[PDB]
PDB file of C-alpha atoms and ligand atoms in Angstrom:
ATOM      1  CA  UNK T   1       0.000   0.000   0.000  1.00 28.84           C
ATOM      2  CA  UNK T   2       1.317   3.294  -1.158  1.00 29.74           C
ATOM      3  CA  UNK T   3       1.712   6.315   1.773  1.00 32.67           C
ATOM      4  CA  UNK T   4      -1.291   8.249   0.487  1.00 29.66           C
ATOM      5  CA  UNK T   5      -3.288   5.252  -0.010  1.00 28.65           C
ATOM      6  CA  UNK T   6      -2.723   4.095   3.427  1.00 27.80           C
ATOM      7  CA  UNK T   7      -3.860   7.374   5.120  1.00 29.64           C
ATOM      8  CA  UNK T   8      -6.815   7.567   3.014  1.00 30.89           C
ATOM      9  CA  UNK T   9      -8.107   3.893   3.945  1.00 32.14           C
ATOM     10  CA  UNK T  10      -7.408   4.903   7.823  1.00 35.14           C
ATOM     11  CA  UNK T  11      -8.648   8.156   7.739  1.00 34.75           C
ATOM     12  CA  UNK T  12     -11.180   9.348   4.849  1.00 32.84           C
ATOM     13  CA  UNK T  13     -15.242   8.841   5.097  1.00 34.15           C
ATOM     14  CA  UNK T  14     -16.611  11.738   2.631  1.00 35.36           C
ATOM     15  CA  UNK T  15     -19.955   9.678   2.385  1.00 33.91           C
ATOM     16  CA  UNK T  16     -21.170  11.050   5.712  1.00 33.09           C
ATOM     17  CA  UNK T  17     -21.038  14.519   6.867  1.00 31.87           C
ATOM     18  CA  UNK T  18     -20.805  13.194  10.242  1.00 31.19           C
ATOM     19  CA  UNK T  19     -21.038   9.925  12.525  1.00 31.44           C
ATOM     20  CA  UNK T  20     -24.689   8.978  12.815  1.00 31.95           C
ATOM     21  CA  UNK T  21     -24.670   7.343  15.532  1.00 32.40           C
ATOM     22  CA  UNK T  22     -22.739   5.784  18.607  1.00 36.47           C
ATOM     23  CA  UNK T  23     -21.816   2.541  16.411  1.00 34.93           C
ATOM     24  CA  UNK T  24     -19.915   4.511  14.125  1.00 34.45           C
ATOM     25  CA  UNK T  25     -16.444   3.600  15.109  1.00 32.71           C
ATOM     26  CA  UNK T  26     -17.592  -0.237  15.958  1.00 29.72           C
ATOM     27  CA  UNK T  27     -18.681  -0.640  11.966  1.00 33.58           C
ATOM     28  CA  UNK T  28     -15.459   1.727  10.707  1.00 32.55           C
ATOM     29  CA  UNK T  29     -12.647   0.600  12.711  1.00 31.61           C
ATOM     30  CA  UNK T  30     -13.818  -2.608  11.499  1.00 29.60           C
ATOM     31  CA  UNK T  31     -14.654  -2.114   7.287  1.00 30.73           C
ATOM     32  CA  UNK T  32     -11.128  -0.410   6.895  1.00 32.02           C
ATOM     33  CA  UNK T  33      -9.498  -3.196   8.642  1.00 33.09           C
ATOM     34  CA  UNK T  34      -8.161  -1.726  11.600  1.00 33.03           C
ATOM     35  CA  UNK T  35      -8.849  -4.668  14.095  1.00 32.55           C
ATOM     36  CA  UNK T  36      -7.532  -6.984  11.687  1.00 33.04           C
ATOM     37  CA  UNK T  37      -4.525  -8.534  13.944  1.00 34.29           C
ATOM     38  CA  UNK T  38      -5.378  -6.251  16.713  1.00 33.65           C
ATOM     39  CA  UNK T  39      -7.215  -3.537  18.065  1.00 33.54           C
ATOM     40  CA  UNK T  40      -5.979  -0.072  16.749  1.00 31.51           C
ATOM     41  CA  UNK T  41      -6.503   2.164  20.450  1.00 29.64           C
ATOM     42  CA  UNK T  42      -6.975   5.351  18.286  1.00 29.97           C
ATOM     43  CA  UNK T  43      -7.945   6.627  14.968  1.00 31.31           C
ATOM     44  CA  UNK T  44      -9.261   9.853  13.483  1.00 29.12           C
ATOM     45  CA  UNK T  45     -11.910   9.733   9.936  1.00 31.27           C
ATOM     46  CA  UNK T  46     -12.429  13.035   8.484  1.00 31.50           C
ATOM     47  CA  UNK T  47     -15.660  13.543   6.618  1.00 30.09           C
ATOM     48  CA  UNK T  48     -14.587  16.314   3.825  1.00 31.20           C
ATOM     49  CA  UNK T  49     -13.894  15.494   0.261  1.00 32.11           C
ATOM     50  CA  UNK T  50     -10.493  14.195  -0.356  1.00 29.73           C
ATOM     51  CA  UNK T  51      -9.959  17.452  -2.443  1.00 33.68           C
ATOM     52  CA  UNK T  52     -10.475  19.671   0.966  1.00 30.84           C
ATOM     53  CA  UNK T  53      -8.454  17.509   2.856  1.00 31.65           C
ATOM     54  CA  UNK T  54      -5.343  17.216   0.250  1.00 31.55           C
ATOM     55  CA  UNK T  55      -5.452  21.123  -0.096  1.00 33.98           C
ATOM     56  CA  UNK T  56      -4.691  21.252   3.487  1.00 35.39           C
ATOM     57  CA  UNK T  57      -1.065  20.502   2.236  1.00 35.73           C
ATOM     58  CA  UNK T  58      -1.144  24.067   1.092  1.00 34.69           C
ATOM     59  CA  UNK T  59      -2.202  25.579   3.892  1.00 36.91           C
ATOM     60  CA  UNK T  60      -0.266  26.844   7.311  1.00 34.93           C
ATOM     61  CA  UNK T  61       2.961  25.231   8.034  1.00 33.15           C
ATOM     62  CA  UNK T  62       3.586  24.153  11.467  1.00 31.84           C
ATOM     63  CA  UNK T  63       5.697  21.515  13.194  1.00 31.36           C
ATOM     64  CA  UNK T  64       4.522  17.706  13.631  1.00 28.54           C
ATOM     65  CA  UNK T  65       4.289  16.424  17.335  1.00 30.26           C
ATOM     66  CA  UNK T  66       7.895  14.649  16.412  1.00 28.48           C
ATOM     67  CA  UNK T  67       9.093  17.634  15.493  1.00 26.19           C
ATOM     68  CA  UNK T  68       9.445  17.014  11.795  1.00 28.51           C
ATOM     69  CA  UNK T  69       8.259  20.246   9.599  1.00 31.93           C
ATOM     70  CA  UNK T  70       5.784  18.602   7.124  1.00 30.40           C
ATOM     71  CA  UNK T  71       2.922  19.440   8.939  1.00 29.95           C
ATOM     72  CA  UNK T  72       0.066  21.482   7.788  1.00 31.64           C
ATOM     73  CA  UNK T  73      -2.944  22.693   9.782  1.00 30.07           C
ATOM     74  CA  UNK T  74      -6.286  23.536   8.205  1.00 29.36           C
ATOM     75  CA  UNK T  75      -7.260  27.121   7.854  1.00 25.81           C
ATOM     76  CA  UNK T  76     -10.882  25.880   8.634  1.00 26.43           C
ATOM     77  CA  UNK T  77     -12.761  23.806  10.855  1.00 27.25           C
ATOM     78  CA  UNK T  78     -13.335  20.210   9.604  1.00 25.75           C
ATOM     79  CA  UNK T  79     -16.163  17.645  10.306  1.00 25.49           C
ATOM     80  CA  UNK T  80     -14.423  14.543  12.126  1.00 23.10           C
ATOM     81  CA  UNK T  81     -15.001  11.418  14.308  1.00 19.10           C
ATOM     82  CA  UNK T  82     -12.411  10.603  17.131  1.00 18.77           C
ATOM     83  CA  UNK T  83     -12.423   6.651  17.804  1.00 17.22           C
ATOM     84  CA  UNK T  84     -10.963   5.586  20.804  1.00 17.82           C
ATOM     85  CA  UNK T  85     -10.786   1.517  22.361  1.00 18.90           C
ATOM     86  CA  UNK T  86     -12.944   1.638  25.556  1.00 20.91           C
ATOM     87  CA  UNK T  87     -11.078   0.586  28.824  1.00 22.09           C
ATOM     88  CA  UNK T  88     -12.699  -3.072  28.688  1.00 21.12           C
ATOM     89  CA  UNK T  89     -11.736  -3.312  24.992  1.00 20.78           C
ATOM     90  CA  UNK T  90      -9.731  -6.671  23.775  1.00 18.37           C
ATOM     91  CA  UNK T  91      -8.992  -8.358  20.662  1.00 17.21           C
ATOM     92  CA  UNK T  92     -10.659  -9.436  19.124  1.00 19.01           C
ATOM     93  CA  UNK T  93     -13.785  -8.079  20.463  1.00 18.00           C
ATOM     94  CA  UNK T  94     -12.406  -4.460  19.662  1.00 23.41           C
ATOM     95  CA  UNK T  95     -15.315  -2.088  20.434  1.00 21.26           C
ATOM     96  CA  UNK T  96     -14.889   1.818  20.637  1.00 19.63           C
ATOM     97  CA  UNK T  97     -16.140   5.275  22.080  1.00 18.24           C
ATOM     98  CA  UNK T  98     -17.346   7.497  19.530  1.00 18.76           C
ATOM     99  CA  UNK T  99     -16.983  11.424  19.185  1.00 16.58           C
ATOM    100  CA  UNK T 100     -17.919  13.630  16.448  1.00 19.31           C
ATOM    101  CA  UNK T 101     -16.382  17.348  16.939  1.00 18.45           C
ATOM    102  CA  UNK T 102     -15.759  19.967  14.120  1.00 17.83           C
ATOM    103  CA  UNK T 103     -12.170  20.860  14.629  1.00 15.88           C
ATOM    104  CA  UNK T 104      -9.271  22.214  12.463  1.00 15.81           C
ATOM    105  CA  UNK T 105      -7.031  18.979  11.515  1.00 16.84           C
ATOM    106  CA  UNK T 106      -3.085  18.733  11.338  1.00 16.21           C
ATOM    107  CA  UNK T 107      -1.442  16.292   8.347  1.00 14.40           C
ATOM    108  CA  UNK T 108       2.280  15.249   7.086  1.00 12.17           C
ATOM    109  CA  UNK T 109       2.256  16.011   3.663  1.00 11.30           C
ATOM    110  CA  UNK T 110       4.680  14.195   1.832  1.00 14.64           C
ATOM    111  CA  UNK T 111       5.754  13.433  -2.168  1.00 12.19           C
ATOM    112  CA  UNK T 112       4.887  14.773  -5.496  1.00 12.26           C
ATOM    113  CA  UNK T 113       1.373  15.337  -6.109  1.00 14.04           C
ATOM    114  CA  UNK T 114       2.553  16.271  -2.271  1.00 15.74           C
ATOM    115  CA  UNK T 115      -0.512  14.889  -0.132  1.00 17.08           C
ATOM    116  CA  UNK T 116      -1.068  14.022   2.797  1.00 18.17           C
ATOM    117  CA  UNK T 117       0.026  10.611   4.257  1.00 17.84           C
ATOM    118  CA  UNK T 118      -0.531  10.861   8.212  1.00 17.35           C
ATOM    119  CA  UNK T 119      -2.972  12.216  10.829  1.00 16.58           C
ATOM    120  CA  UNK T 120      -0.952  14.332  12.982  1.00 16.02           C
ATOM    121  CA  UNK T 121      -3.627  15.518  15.454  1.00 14.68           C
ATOM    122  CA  UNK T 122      -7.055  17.882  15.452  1.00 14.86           C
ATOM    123  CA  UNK T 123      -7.548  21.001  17.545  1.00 17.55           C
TER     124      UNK T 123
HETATM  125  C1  LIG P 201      -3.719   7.234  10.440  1.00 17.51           C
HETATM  126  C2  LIG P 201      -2.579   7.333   9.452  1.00 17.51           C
HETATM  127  O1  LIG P 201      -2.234   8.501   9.296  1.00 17.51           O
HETATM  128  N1  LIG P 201      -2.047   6.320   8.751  1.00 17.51           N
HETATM  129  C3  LIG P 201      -0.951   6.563   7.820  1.00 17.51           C
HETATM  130  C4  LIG P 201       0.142   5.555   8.217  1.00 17.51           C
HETATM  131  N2  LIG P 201       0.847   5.807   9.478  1.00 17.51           N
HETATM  132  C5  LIG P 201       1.911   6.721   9.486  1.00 17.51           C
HETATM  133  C6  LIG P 201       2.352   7.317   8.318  1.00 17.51           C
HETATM  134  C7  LIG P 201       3.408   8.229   8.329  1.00 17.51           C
HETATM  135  C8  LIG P 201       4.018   8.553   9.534  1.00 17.51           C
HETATM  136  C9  LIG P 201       3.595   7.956  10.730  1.00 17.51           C
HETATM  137  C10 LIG P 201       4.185   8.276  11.977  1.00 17.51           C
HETATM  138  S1  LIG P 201       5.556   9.419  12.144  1.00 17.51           S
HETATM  139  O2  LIG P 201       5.621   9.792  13.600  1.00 17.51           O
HETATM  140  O3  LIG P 201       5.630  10.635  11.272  1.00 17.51           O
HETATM  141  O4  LIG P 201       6.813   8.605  11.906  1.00 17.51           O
HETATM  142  C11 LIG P 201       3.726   7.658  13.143  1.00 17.51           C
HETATM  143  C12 LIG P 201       2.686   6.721  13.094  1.00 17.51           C
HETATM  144  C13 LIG P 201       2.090   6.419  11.867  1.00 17.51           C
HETATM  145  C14 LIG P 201       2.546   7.036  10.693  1.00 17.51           C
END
């Protein structure tokens, strides 16, 4: 799997505008194989077109939590589910807490078209 198409299996869902309800991350963590060999603990889907989120490569620069400089942080708020394992959560019963939030998001942007291949954080 190619960088960008890695980060856009684990992180893009433009067919919602939001998560309906508190399932959500139970049905998604699931359908883009994150609980595959075990259970991913966190995990971020944005629901905005891939075009909005790629452009964020464009937009302000700031650093990445390691400190790298590829980072980019949206101009605008973005629709987007958190997914978190519950405390009781084991594989490979993986079941997760769902939270929907419109916050500004915060990718590595990497290669040429220069997209986005990793989830750096929301705020
Ligand atoms: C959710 C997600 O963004 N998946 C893309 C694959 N994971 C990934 C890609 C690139 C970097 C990276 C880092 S790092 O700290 O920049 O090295 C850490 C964890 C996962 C990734």
């Amino acid at each position: 799997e190619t960088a960008a198409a890695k980060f856009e299996r684990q992180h893009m869902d433009s067919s919602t505008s939001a998560a309906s309800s508190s399932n959500y991350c139970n049905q998604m963590m699931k359908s883009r194989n994150l609980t595959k060999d075990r259970c991913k603990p966190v995990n971020t889907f944005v629901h905005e077109s891939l075009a909005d989120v790629q452009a964020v490569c464009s937009q302000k620069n700031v650093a990445c939590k390691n400190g790298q400089t590829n980072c980019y942080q949206s101009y605008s708020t973005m629709s987007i589910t958190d997914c978190r394992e519950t405390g009781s959560s084991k594989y490979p019963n993986c079941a997760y807490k769902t939270t929907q939030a419109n916050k500004h998001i915060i990718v590595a942007c990497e290669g040429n078209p220069y997209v986005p291949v990793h989830f750096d954080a929301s705020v």
